[PDB]
């Protein structure tokens, strides 16, 4: 289907497509396009090789006795590689869908982007490019290199980073981008959902230029940027206490629905924040890339596997480091706008509104992380919001997941029923105080801890993370202590913070949750026995047998390293 016209947004620099001839030629397409997509425009294809699931040996073997109940009563879910046929079918089903570019809400959205940018600049100043030390802290060392870099034989981002060759490469990327004819600008893809990512040099560049957005979010009361999961429940509780009603709605396929119009506003805002005029040019040129995404996706026809070069318009790619910060900001702005219009908040009050949301003052609160949000309102405003705010997000194509288009919002009045960041939050006692701590299906928890000496270091970090965040769930505390008992001391955990250490102890956990008002293993709380069902493991004979055999399993899994016994910190 032909693309609609684009939105023309007053006061914003248009995101003109770059000259992509150089980056297209880098993909070495062989054949003219077949054209079987409805939105993406196929430019060509080439014959490929079928592209690709492995469980961590340490975590996997420790939970092996529970695999059956976790697969039968929970959401563990396992694993075969996705076929090219299945990859293209999922692309067509979920990604090959035109964003809604044309609607009447850009002028008011722009006003709020401008308000937020002005508040950040007034309070915190402009945004510098990341330093090398800052980039080293944020890179995923296991990330892929990308087809355009595969012939340099680095293996992964970590090895590429360590080599130091990226320093010249990112400046080569910068110069070509600013010229209007970029190199290495075509997205690679892999299935896990389709992940889209630029080559490693491009990714280090975009991290350097846009990585500072997280620093502003750390200052915002509506963001959880930089904060650990163990803090989120208390923030949900605090926000609810100030309001009394919550609306928690997910958008189906958020990344696929973001329009070039919204990207135009993102770029507008971020260029406002830049330290110097060259930085603003760099940001604007990156968004000229983002808004005109070219990507290679696999398919299979008559037994022949193709690498297909496709061109879209708008949308958001997942394997882009700024995506989290940009999604969070755009989610905050679109949600605040729809709420303010629906509740009739006058536009002259919008600067105060955005300040109060940022300062957690007043009778309206937001919590936002990427495409996930909870809106908190008094009951009276919640009813007004629930009755019609969906019309504005529908206008923008931000259709809500799993409900009818014009279904009124569900108004949540119990803090324990609010889903945020894929968890709910339950009250847990630490000594004589209560903190709200995260729960979700334990099959999901265990699966994420299993599906990736790097392997041992990775497992050990999963155990440290599980102990800090899920010690209130007994099976999670047990698995964590077992992980820490089977993984050796002295590994490089930082390559995989406050608690990321071999000598982790309760005092560190109490410092994070109660600021050290409590102490000891005995004041780390548990959920009530009566609630150990449903999303949590029922404590039946299967569970008690696993617990009985864990000490032996730990001893059998240990090898040549130095280990410490952690299971004695519990039953
Ligand atoms: Mg939510």
Author numbering: 307 to 358, 362 to 387, 390 to 503, 519 to 778, 786 to 829, 837 to 911
Sentences from the paper on this structure:
One of their genome segments encodes NSP1 homologous to flavivirus NS5. NSP1 comprises both the methyltransferase (MTase) and RNA-dependent RNA polymerase (RdRP) modules playing essential roles in viral genome replication and capping. The NSP1 RdRP exhibits a characteristic architectural feature commonly found in viral RdRPs, known as encircled right-hand architecture.
Subsequently, the structures of native D55 and D307 were resolved through molecular replacement, utilizing the Se-Met-derived D55 structure as the search model. Due to the significant similarity between the native structures of D55 and D307, with a root-mean-square deviation (RMSD) value of merely 0.2 Å for all superimposable α-carbon atoms (with D307 structure as the reference, covering 99.5% of residues), we primarily utilize the 1.84-Å D307 structure for subsequent illustrations. The D307 structure exhibits unresolved regions, namely residues 359–361 and 388–389 in the index finger, residues 504–518 at the tip of the ring finger, residues 779–785 in the thumb loop located between α-helices 21 and 22, residues 830–836 in part of PE, and residues 912–915 at the very C-terminus. The NSP1 RdRP closely resembles the RdRPs found in the Flavivirus genus, which includes the N-terminal extension (NE) and one-segment PE, both of which are characteristic features of flaviviruses. The JMTV PE exhibits partial disorder, but it is characterized by a one-segment structure that closely resembles the PEs of flaviviruses in terms of length and structure. However, it is worth noting that the linker region in JMTV NE is approximately 10 residues longer compared to that of flaviviruses, and it forms a cofold with the palm domain. Remarkably, the quantity of intermediate products (specifically, 4-mer in the P2-to-P5 assay and 4-mer/5-mer in the P2-to-P7 assay) generated by NSP1 D307 was observed to be greater than that of FL NSP1 (when comparing lanes 13–21/22–30 and lanes 53–61/62–70).
